[PDB]
Amino acid sequence: GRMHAPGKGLSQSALPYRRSVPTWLKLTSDDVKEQIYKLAKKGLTPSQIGVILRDSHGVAQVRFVTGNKILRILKSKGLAPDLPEDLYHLIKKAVAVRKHLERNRKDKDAKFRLILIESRIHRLARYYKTKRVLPPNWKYESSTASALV
Amino acid sequence: GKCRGLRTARKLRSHRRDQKWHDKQYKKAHLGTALKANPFGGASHAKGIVLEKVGVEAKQPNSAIRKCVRVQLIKNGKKITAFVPNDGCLNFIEENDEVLVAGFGRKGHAVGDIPGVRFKVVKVANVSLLALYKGKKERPR
Amino acid sequence: VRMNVLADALKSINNAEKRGKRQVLIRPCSKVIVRFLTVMMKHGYIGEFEIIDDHRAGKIVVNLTGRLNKCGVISPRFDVQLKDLEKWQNNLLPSRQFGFIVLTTSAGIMDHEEARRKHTGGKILGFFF
RNA sequence: AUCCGUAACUUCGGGAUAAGGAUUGGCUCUAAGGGCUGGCAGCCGACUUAGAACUGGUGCGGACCAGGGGAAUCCGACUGU
RNA sequence: CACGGGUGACGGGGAAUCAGGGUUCGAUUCCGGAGAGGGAGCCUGAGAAACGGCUACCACAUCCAAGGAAGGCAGCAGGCGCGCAAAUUACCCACUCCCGACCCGGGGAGGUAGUGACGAAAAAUAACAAUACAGGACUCUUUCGAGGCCCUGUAAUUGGAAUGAGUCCACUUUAAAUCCUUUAACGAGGAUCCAUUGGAGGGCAAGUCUGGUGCCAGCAGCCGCGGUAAUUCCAGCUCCAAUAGCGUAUAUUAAAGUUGCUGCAGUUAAAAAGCUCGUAGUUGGAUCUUGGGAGCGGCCGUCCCCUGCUCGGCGCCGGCCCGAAGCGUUUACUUUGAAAAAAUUAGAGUGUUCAAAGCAGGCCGCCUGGAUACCGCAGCUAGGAAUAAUGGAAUAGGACCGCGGUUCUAUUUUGUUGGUUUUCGGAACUGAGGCCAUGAUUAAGAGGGACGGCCGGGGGCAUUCGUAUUGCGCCGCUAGAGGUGAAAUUCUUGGACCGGCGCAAGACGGACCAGAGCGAAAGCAUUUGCCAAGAAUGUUUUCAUUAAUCAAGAACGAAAGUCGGAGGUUCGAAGACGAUCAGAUACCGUCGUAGUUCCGACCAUAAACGAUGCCGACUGGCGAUGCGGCGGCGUUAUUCCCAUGACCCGCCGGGCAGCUUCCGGGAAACCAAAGUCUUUGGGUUCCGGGGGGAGUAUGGUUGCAAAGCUGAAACUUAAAGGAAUUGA
RNA sequence: AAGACGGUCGAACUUGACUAUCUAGAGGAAGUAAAAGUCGUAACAAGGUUUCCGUAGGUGAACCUGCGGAAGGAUCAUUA
RNA sequence: UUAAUG
Ligand SMILES: [Mg+2]
Ligand SMILES: [Mg+2]
Ligand SMILES: [Mg+2]
Ligand SMILES: [Mg+2]
Ligand SMILES: [Mg+2]
Ligand SMILES: [Mg+2]
Ligand SMILES: [Mg+2]
Ligand SMILES: [Mg+2]
Ligand SMILES: [Mg+2]
Ligand SMILES: [Mg+2]
Ligand SMILES: [Mg+2]
Ligand SMILES: [Mg+2]
Ligand SMILES: [Mg+2]
Ligand SMILES: [Mg+2]
Ligand SMILES: [Mg+2]
Ligand SMILES: [Mg+2]
Ligand SMILES: [Mg+2]
Ligand SMILES: [Mg+2]
Ligand SMILES: [Mg+2]
Ligand SMILES: [Mg+2]
Ligand SMILES: [Mg+2]
Ligand SMILES: [Mg+2]
Ligand SMILES: [Mg+2]
Ligand SMILES: [Mg+2]
Ligand SMILES: [Mg+2]
Ligand SMILES: [Mg+2]
Ligand SMILES: [Mg+2]
Ligand SMILES: [Mg+2]
Ligand SMILES: [Mg+2]
Ligand SMILES: [Mg+2]
Ligand SMILES: [Mg+2]
Ligand SMILES: [Mg+2]
Ligand SMILES: [Mg+2]
Ligand SMILES: [Mg+2]
Ligand SMILES: [Mg+2]
Ligand SMILES: [Mg+2]
Ligand SMILES: [Mg+2]
Ligand SMILES: [Mg+2]
Ligand SMILES: [Mg+2]
Ligand SMILES: [Mg+2]
Ligand SMILES: [Mg+2]
Ligand SMILES: [Mg+2]
Ligand SMILES: [Mg+2]
Ligand SMILES: [Mg+2]
Ligand SMILES: [Mg+2]
Ligand SMILES: [Mg+2]
Ligand SMILES: [Mg+2]
Ligand SMILES: [Mg+2]
């Protein structure tokens, strides 16, 4: 079951049993890390970094080839953002829906969806407060949320 | 139970404590409204002064004239249509006499053919109506 | 969501015993489930099982006989002393001749008879007979 | 004037200084509320507020200034003419 | 769940009902607290805010010469009142102790008697023999009948044999008595020395007996009985239940699986908030220690070992063994031990003649007992680490084995007196190293997010189209047109209705339209454009438990209704008229206001329904449909082929569904969930406890109002209701 | 020793406020229980206008009507 | 079309 939806969808990735690196992949772990450094220096979310790596370079799992995962490597070098990417996209979606309501106040369905997005933002906000990657004095304020894209 | 957690004791106890008040016997026993409405006031017997004798018509199919007494209590002053149990025992009860009044066994409820009578008469002027019916004792005159 | 994995697996094998399957696939593999299956094995209600170990929550395939009448579960994990275990086996087992109530102890997961042998109470797992 | 406290009703804004109480004099103190110069030091200027003691034949907003109040009914909303 | 309120609440050990769980009570002899009519204050004294101590005020009350004095029985007896409700104005310090100057005195504490059917234990009201009879195991007899080695009962038939209950001398008992036990003498055949309390239709054991009454009296806790043949009233006889006890009234427990932790239900009997978010509360995926060795018995069972770092002797040749002390994440959980007042409960022993009881007692001075178990919850302690929490090291301010400097310093030491600086050790700060296998479990058919192609009467804004309507203008011909079961109210030579061409504004979005789709629900259907969102699928993406249900709170919420503006074509509450009817203030027809249409604010109510809360797992198939993805003979379009649309056959995820049967359930109708329920426990909210009164009163809160939320009691009733069968 | 000023504890009296229980009351408006009462027939069969829910108006009265739902309806169905 | 009551 979904969180804020009655759907019961079963569609996600099925990682294989074998954690070993394949024979054809001659790309070393340092070369994979330098490609991750180049993509993060160009400016790209780690999800899209992993997508571009499994499309173009033919490396499916960074965790299987290298030692660490992608946002962990960005944290180890210093390319990670201030707040995580799922919270970032939820804040961006909330700003978009709030601008939509400001243009059209009558949209009660988008108002309900805005309340749902706010609830998911506050759930991830208290979760990252408990995990201590965000400061405890951080607070989602919709008047100041728009400047963060 | 519905909530089967390991530490739901206050939830189960508060839910049962709320739902006991919807029982008929529990609420009648634990509120003072029924005890205030009871003319005995949590008593099994009560003495009272006869003031008049009433012929009460009966209910549906059974059709008769029951014999009751307008008893005014001493401990409260309330008025009770007390019932004269046995045959021919209304003549033993005279006006302005102290009679003992008890229940009828349905715990404050009208019983059978008689509408609106909950209580009955046991003794008449410190002489029991059972002995007056059997013929053992005599009315003191 | 999935709260009690052990209760889900035992209700699955109970439905499999009621329908009459020779073997059933229960989907998660927990240590409590594996020790429960070995406790049923040492008394002989079920056959010899196996687990399928991926690097995830593994699976379990249990060969089933027809000796298992009902496999039950007691949720949550109530504490059971040696004084109260007689009342537990009175009101949960069908007889004092057969039937077993397994409960986890300090020595390990073991049934009520071995709990009486080793003199150790503990939290209840379920029942099987 | 200061300290309490303030009801029915209501258009929740009011009623309301509602209603009902206590104190108020003089004298002698204490505490708090600040500037200029070189968490400290020096030099100065202001009226208030709070508290205590003593005392006068219980007298003290001692003259003057200065709302009687409460519960209801009818009419007009009101301010105004 | 503070604070406030109520208690017909002193608290506890404990009492009753009890399967296991609980529920109710506890003023009451033991422990602790409070008080002496209501408060307040004090002397004395170690100890009092004491009241059989004082000092004031209030209530009550005594004497008086009118100035004044004196009181505190919720102590023992007793009196009044209050009551449904409760004892003698007795004897004694002899038992138990208490106090005093104490072996001596005092004790209404206490002991013993008087009342006592609160209650508990034991327990008389007869038994035997002989006659008549009525029968049963034998013998005999076809049955009828008969003999008694064996019987069993009945009958105001007879007979002695035995005893109390009472009477009563005498001991004994006791401070003196009373009662019990003992004991002479009396004392029993209708052993009149007479056992009652309720009932006899069913529940519930026990007369279709007799007489009277005739829906009257009355019986009846429930159903019911009595209306002139009463198995139910009133009397007699008989029988039944208990037996010195029984009935009645009230509180309470089991019954009640009708409060449901064990262990109730929520489609139709009473029931799931209209739906969604959501904090407390509750529940939370998998994963970190396997095994090996020695000894015994017949591959199995069982016991032992697999922690680390100051003080002394089986002691031995700086090292080894053993014992003692101290520190080694924290709990929840389990076991033992201590500390847990007695009285009570279970229970050892013991012939109070038995028993309830008591702690006694038994042997020819002695022998002995007066145990033990339990004592919830919390606190202490020592074993265990399976289960549930809890952390380590991730800007490496991390452990480990060592080093070099700065400051301070217990002091051993220079034969004994003093300073300074070092060797050597302890505390703090600080620099260069060596090493960890150096350190981050997996990515849940959990969830969140990114991305790809979709998909959809989902939502909002703007635009556009379609007809029909009603009204107007013009033209043509007309006496009818509307409307009804039938007529009329209505229009109509002032041209109604109809046909044709235009104009008008407001609606509505047919047929396509389906047991099809989307949306949390309410709901959503002309075309195009813009904006934000969403399910499912695809994924060898990312985060790594971030999750589920949710008091308080919050968003949306049909239609109707309310407040403002706009517009009002049709329909149409109210209202008017014509029909029908005995009557219509209704159904029918003609008009017709609010409303129905748009925008901005309220209202938060529906048969808001699937009368079925949400998430998760499992147990049968069949043909489909919708979306997305994948595979495979072949037709049809682009046309000139690859590759994409339309078809055909399959596979998978869930989305609304349907059909089928002994899964299984339910009272059945029926349901693949309403199943996995007495073989009862996956997690979490709301809600029901017979029917009315009543969703009513009152209190609070919201709203402009209508009304919305919460929400009783008194009183009344023995039924109300659900499913299914057969008649009508 | 008596007595006096002051302080403290503070009984008690009066006034005012709050809160709890009981109760009088003209008149109004409900429920329950009889009945050999009056008027109509709302509902149960398509109860003769199918029934019921929500929301408004009106009428002696059950009730009637408007708008939106539901079948607990008399339809599980109506054809290219 | 009308058709209410016991
Ligand atoms: Mg949720
Ligand atoms: Mg006023
Ligand atoms: Mg007036
Ligand atoms: Mg004026
Ligand atoms: Mg009290
Ligand atoms: Mg009390
Ligand atoms: Mg007590
Ligand atoms: Mg005292
Ligand atoms: Mg007294
Ligand atoms: Mg005193
Ligand atoms: Mg006294
Ligand atoms: Mg005393
Ligand atoms: Mg008595
Ligand atoms: Mg003595
Ligand atoms: Mg003496
Ligand atoms: Mg005494
Ligand atoms: Mg006798
Ligand atoms: Mg009789
Ligand atoms: Mg009977
Ligand atoms: Mg019988
Ligand atoms: Mg009878
Ligand atoms: Mg009970
Ligand atoms: Mg029971
Ligand atoms: Mg029930
Ligand atoms: Mg219902
Ligand atoms: Mg619902
Ligand atoms: Mg776990
Ligand atoms: Mg004890
Ligand atoms: Mg159309
Ligand atoms: Mg709520
Ligand atoms: Mg509306
Ligand atoms: Mg409207
Ligand atoms: Mg309007
Ligand atoms: Mg019309
Ligand atoms: Mg008319
Ligand atoms: Mg009409
Ligand atoms: Mg509702
Ligand atoms: Mg409902
Ligand atoms: Mg159950
Ligand atoms: Mg009820
Ligand atoms: Mg009856
Ligand atoms: Mg119903
Ligand atoms: Mg019809
Ligand atoms: Mg009718
Ligand atoms: Mg009709
Ligand atoms: Mg009808
Ligand atoms: Mg109907
Ligand atoms: Mg009308």
Curated annotation (Swiss-Prot), chain A:
**What modifications does the entry list under PTM / processing?**
Ubiquitinated at Lys-26 by RNF14 and RNF25 in response to ribosome collisions (ribosome stalling).
Which Gene3D superfamilies does the UniProt entry name for this protein? 4.10.860.130, S15/NS1, RNA-binding (1.10.287.10)
Per the UniProt entry, what is one GO biological process? Answer: translation
- The SS bond pairs are none
Q: Which residues carry this modification: Phosphotyrosine?
A: 37
Task: Enumerate the PROSITE patterns for this protein.
Answer: RIBOSOMAL_S15
| Recorded GO MF terms | small ribosomal subunit rRNA binding; structural constituent of ribosome
Phosphoserine: residues carrying this PTM: 29
Q: Which SUPFAM superfamilies match?
A: S15/NS1 RNA-binding domain
InterPro entries tied to this protein: Ribosomal_uS15 (IPR000589), Ribosomal_uS15_arc_euk (IPR023029), Ribosomal_uS15_N (IPR012606), uS15_NS1_RNA-bd_sf (IPR009068)
> Which key words are in the record?
Acetylation, Cytoplasm, Isopeptide bond, Nucleus, Phosphoprotein, Ribonucleoprotein, Ribosomal protein, Ubl conjugation
Task: Return any one Pfam family short name.
Answer: Ribosomal_S15
Q: Kindly list the positions at which N6-succinyllysine occurs in this protein.
A: 26, 33
- Kindly list the places in or outside the cell where this protein is found, as annotated in its UniProt entry: Cytoplasm; Nucleus, Nucleolus
Cross-link Glycyl lysine isopeptide (Lys-Gly) (interchain with G-Cter in SUMO2) - where?
42
Coarse class of the primary localization is cytoplasm
Q: Which residues carry this modification: N6-acetyllysine?
A: 26
For the cross-link Glycyl lysine isopeptide (Lys-Gly) (interchain with G-Cter in ubiquitin), list the residue numbers: 26
One Gene Ontology cellular component annotation held by this UniProt entry: cytosolic small ribosomal subunit
Self-association and partners: Component of the small ribosomal subunit. Part of the small subunit (SSU) processome, composed of more than 70 proteins and the RNA chaperone small nucleolar RNA (snoRNA) U3.
Q: Its function? A: Component of the small ribosomal subunit. The ribosome is a large ribonucleoprotein complex responsible for the synthesis of proteins in the cell. Part of the small subunit (SSU) processome, first precursor of the small eukaryotic ribosomal subunit. During the assembly of the SSU processome in the nucleolus, many ribosome biogenesis factors, an RNA chaperone and ribosomal proteins associate with the nascent pre-rRNA and work in concert to generate RNA folding, modifications, rearrangements and cleavage as well as targeted degradation of pre-ribosomal RNA by the RNA exosome.
Q: What is this protein called?
A: Small ribosomal subunit protein uS15
The gene designation is RPS13
Curated annotation (Swiss-Prot), chain B:
Instruction: Give the modified residues of type N6-acetyllysine.
Output: 134
**Cross-link for Glycyl lysine isopeptide (Lys-Gly) (interchain with G-Cter in SUMO2), residue positions:** 36
A GO MF annotation of the entry reads: structural constituent of ribosome
**Where on the chain is 3-hydroxyproline found, per UniProt?**
61
Supply one GO BP term: translation
Tell me how the protein is altered or processed after translation.
Answer: Hydroxylation at Pro-61 affects translation termination efficiency.
Keywords of the record, alphabetical order, are: Acetylation, Cytoplasm, Endoplasmic reticulum, Hydroxylation, Isopeptide bond, Nucleus, Ribonucleoprotein, Ribosomal protein, Ubl conjugation
InterPro entries with a match to the protein in the record: NA-bd_OB-fold (IPR012340), Ribosomal_uS12 (IPR006032), Ribosomal_uS12_euk/arc (IPR005680)
Q: Which residues carry this modification: N6-succinyllysine?
A: 53
Question: Is Cytoplasm a UniProt keyword of this protein?
Answer: yes
Listed under subunit, the entry gives: Component of the 40S small ribosomal subunit. Part of the small subunit (SSU) processome, composed of more than 70 proteins and the RNA chaperone small nucleolar RNA (snoRNA) U3.
Role of this protein: Component of the ribosome, a large ribonucleoprotein complex responsible for the synthesis of proteins in the cell. The small ribosomal subunit (SSU) binds messenger RNAs (mRNAs) and translates the encoded message by selecting cognate aminoacyl-transfer RNA (tRNA) molecules. The large subunit (LSU) contains the ribosomal catalytic site termed the peptidyl transferase center (PTC), which catalyzes the formation of peptide bonds, thereby polymerizing the amino acids delivered by tRNAs into a polypeptide chain.
Q: What is this protein called?
A: Small ribosomal subunit protein uS12
Tell me what organism the protein belongs to.
Oryctolagus cuniculus
Q: What is the lineage of its organism?
A: Eukaryota, Metazoa, Chordata, Craniata, Vertebrata
Q: Which gene encodes it?
A: RPS23
Curated annotation (Swiss-Prot), chain C:
Query: Pfam families in the record, alphabetically?
Result: Ribosomal_S8
Q: What are the disulfide bonds?
A: none
Q: Which PROSITE patterns match?
A: RIBOSOMAL_S8
**Is the Protease keyword given for this protein?**
no
Gene Ontology terms: biological process: translation
Look up keyword Ribosomal protein and say if it applies.
Answer: yes
* Source domain of life: Eukaryota
Positions carrying N6-succinyllysine = 87
Q: Which InterPro entries match?
A: Ribosomal_uS8, Ribosomal_uS8_CS, Ribosomal_uS8_sf
Annotated Gene Ontology cellular component terms? cytosolic ribosome; nucleolus; ribonucleoprotein complex
Listed GO MF terms: structural constituent of ribosome
Q: Which UniProt keywords apply?
A: Cytoplasm, Nucleus, Ribonucleoprotein, Ribosomal protein
**Where is this gene product found?**
Cytoplasm; Nucleus, Nucleolus
Q: What does this chain do?
A: Component of the small ribosomal subunit. Part of the small subunit (SSU) processome, first precursor of the small eukaryotic ribosomal subunit. During the assembly of the SSU processome in the nucleolus, many ribosome biogenesis factors, an RNA chaperone and ribosomal proteins associate with the nascent pre-rRNA and work in concert to generate RNA folding, modifications, rearrangements and cleavage as well as targeted degradation of pre-ribosomal RNA by the RNA exosome. Required for proper erythropoiesis.
Q: Cite the record's note on assembly.
A: Component of the 40S ribosomal subunit. Part of the small subunit (SSU) processome, composed of more than 70 proteins and the RNA chaperone small nucleolar RNA (snoRNA) U3.
Which protein family is it in?
Belongs to the universal ribosomal protein uS8 family.
Specify the protein name: Small ribosomal subunit protein uS8
**What is the phylogenetic placement of the source species in the record?**
Eukaryota, Metazoa, Chordata, Craniata, Vertebrata
